[PDB]
Amino acid sequence: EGAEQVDMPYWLYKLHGLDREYRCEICSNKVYNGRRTFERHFNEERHIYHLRCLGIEPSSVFKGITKIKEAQELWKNM
């Protein structure tokens, strides 16, 4: 019908490391799209709420946490 003849920062988020699938286990098995962002999760309100309310006290020893289990034996070491 009507064939008549005449006559956005794509490479930037990969470069920065974002929009890449990742997950934090201790937080609601939550998903994170960047490694910088997840590295920012280590200092956060909710992340520290999960730690401290979990019985694992806050700040800088537990930063590298992912799963809930290992930091429990780490806190027993504390």
Partner: peptide, 21 residues
């Protein structure tokens, strides 16, 4: 491959450390 997947968890590594942070 196997050596890359053989790695212990960083938290498993923390216990060996006197200054884990």
């Amino acid at each position: 491959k196997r050596r890359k997947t053989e790695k212990p968890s960083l938290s498993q590594l923390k216990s060996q450390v006197p200054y884990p942070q």
